[PDB]
Amino acid sequence: KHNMKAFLDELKAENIKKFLYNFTQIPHLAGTEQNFQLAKQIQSQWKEFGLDSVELAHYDVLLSYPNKTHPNYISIINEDGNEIFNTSLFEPPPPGYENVSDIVPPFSAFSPQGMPEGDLVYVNYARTEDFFKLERDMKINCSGKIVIARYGKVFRGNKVKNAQLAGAKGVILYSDPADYFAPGVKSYPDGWNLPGGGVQRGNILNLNGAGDPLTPGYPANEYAYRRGIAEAVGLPSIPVHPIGYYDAQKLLEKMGGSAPPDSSWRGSLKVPYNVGPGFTGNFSTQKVKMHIHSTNEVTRIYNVIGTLRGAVEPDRYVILGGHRDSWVFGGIDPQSGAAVVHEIVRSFGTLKKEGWRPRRTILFASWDAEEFGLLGSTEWAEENSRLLQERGVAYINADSSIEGNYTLRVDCTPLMYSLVHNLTKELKSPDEGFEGKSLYESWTKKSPSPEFSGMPRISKLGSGNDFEVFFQRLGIASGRARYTKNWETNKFSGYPLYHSVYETYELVEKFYDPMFKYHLTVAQVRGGMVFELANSIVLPFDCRDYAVVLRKYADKIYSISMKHPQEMKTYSVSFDSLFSAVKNFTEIASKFSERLQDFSNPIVLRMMNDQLMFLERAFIDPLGLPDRPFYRHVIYAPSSHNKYAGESFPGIYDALFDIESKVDPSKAWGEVKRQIYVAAFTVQAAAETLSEVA
Template identity: 70%
Template sequence: MHYSLITIWNISLQLYGYENVTNIVPPYNAFSAQGTPEGDLIYVNYARTEDFFKLEREMSINCTGKIVIARYGKIFRGNKVKNAMLAGAIGIILYSDPADYFAPGVQPYPKGWNLPGTAAQRGNVLNLNGAGDPLTPGYPAKEYTFRLDVEEGVGIPKIPVHPIGYNDAEILLRKVRMHVHNTNKITRIYNVIGTIRGSVEPDRYVILGGHRDSWVFGAIDPTSGTAVLQEIVQSFGKLMSKGWKPRRTIIFASWDAEEFGLLGSTEWAEENAKTLQERSIAYINSDSSIEGNYTLRVDCTPLLYQLVYQLTKEISSPDDGFENKSLYESWLEKDPSSENKNFPRINKLGSGSDFEAYFQRLGIASGRARYTKNRKTDKYSSYPVYHTIYETFELVENFYDPTFKKQLSVAQLRGALVYELADSKIIPFNIQDYAKALKNYATSIYNLSKKHDQQLRDHGVSFDSLFSAVKNFSEAASDFHRRLTQVDLNDPIAVRIMNDQLMLLERAFIDPLGLPGRQHIIFAPSSHNKYAGESFPGIYDAMFDIENKADPRSAWTEVKKHISVAAFTIQAAAGTLKEVL
């Protein structure tokens, strides 16, 4: 029996209260290959590397020549497609499983905020090393730029991909025919850039950017973030009308085509890379301001930890039961750090939004903040109606943030970050937090390696150089902050020297010869899940599944190489903190 996915998405277009809307984009995965593959259907769980390993190594199931069906969640959808291609699949169907996208005890939309069975999650399935236009990797997609042919585009899938809802997933039988008629074409996109020129250091930039394109209505992603960006711009406009000017230049950016692979932000970063690397203090992301309504979530460079803590103590908590308390207090109580219960949890930056090119490739200190779910009890992926037609204004107004106070808190934090970074005489970065983070990350990757203890000894692999470099960096950070407390704030040259060292520290962790598209030695998206941030990604990737590598000696040599590169990079970063001769 065959099921045409053309029929499936027509059924799935039924939307409560929006029946008369005629221009809804039907469910599809951007950059899918065209085709009509037909074959046996194999369920591959989340289509992670380990899922295919289980099928092949433990169950003796070969996916070659088969169509696979995978549930969304755990990893970026583009990684799922890449893994399916590597396993020999001729097509992949993606669906949102109720186990991952349906919270117990909550009605489906419109009676509640849960995912209806007809909803299909859209999204791009590019799998680039980095982000941006797959036809101009590493370079801006301008009229003069050389372009690859679409068939040669970097990271574009070679097999058809299509999303469906869980109602449709239930009726698929063992044999399926896919009809995917996506067409890829070159089209113009538009970024909107606004600036406030700095009054003292106009050649130093603080960037606030967020995308405005969405899959269908996009009330949460990105509109909850777009609204915050607009409010912050308006607030700075009011300050300027009263005569205020920032010390440094502020750049506001509304990015286009984020949903197609961070295109607008990445192409602008590539076009202006040299200038941005020379002049940028920080990039603050303004994507979705809510993905839940339980507590604050922050992902950022360790340089921003102290500033985030300070600012959240000055913002009122919007949470019930925390009246007359700060955002910091509610955040700390609801989500303390696993490393130190005296501080709220802050996550590593991975990918999946517009900060990627600025942080991972250009080495610009970056951060993002939004409201999120309870990560301990709410085990569903993202928010249930993510990237579906049910992501409407009514969803936000009726269920997620009826008073809009949580989005206000996010706006206050994002705006305050921009204000402090742009107007403080000394850039409010704390390098000692970076030193503590490096120590934690080095310990973590070392502990991960200990399950291969015998192989470490057999192949002469040692982490001593890494721990030595971290120790030297910690000492340099302490000495830097000692000197920072003694700097003459009335001496513009002395202030500029210290600020330049602060600004350029993140750049010191960028290795031009590093992992393709992931040049940050300390933080990068995982090669197995682009959404997740990985510390010491080179070492981590080299050790992944190392026990099954065909040539163990060369595999462990690769581990030694990446330990050496990480140690050198940290040592070199420590050198940038020394007193200027």
């Protein structure tokens, strides 16, 4: 038989290991020849594996690279302008790679050029609440200062935006061992911790879903009209550079001015963590000087798009996609995910060669330039938006398969909760101590739902990965799953070697998953989801699960507003319409579910399949969210404070955020009311897509 079990059993840990090794021997930086060569390799192999068609889709997008003959670095400069300390020009390469060429040195992609000199202010994680603390509570002024911030907690681009709006003239990002050195584990190469010379690369854009900075709304094809750099989307206005904790210690050790306001501001270095501004008495005349010379350059990128045509519904697309480009070797990010996709394609192709075809079309994607702001997935979705809007069933992401080895981590639309629960109950746990138990059982035990006993946690989708255009722009049901760590407060901070030269094949094979069993488990979850979506007669979505969360989000946003009872009285701020719509959705979804169970009629089936496919679509508002036109989903958006985090009822959330500080409360509460109306309306309209059609 050619069923899900046949598919799943064909998947091999040994193959995932071979592919991971193959993808991580040299760097695959977006826009470089090495990454174009790997694209052509994957294209050839997917053809060999059996896909019907496999094409490269290329675009010319704005990328950013250091100047090879004019290196970026930071100094402490004394009174006469002598540079008395310089940060490192490169990370010491790991064992056996010390002769590898084309390792991009640490830099912040899309930083402008500059050589700002000034006094340091330490801003903790550079979160919105950290700047509130500095400015409002401590009366410390960042204007014209160079800010130094530790990585962690939120996307680095949010830190840079926050620093810019505080009036900073530069930002230094560093990795504190508090966040990137787990106690009792050794530094790379002898363990998975970050050494003091290690540095996290990464882009610092604030694109809000736009894709290539120069072509928002339209694919960056051969005839594209491009904005001028001054009108580009999302570029930072101040120089930015990342450093390791040996270098950070040198910049922080001399810091004076105010003490840290409390212990949540102190990392693990042997320094005071004084906020500044500037250095203590002896060194009061020394300054910090950045030297940034990176350039932004329009550069060709390449997505690989493979098609396995559906036997029955070829015009319905289930998409498995993840990126290929890496900062350096990409041993975890992304090749641990790319190797899983490769093995999934191989397994599906094995069935296809024996005469099987899925019910619906499956599209497989190897995206490029993800690290530079989700550019390859976004430009391709811009190009194909009409096809995706009317035909897209679901998008399953496939970046890093592991970021730890503790338990499963799933983020997805409520429409996929039931699918995930059911599939994980049928898969074996790879975990020690759970042998012969289901993955559902180990996951639920290790990651309990905060709301329901006997259920696992499933998180909301925000952004920071390639599902963003499909979910938040186009409203296609999306999901992701990976293995993760225990480390709760590190959720958005990355594993220690994230985006460093030390993230290698050996890191994975020695320290994360020597048997490739966690990789195989993730291949089973991702491939199992794709299989069910592409093959189930009735699409495997449960609208009632959306009803349950919508009530939870409505309770939560109302609870936020209810911290301001006098203003809700004054301005007549009612959530009644939103609860009404949520009640209606619950009622209608229950009735639709009964019909879906109670309905030989392919037109009624597909009618119902279309109602299921278009339900996520119905949460899209064509006018988008305020000042974020490419975030169009009304129930979820990336947090305006942290792109990695999903926020629910984002339009109402942002209207309420820090509202007590607004100068015109009438206007501010009027906008809360407007957002309640938009949310109630959209929930009701989505409900009505599930009513009988005529």
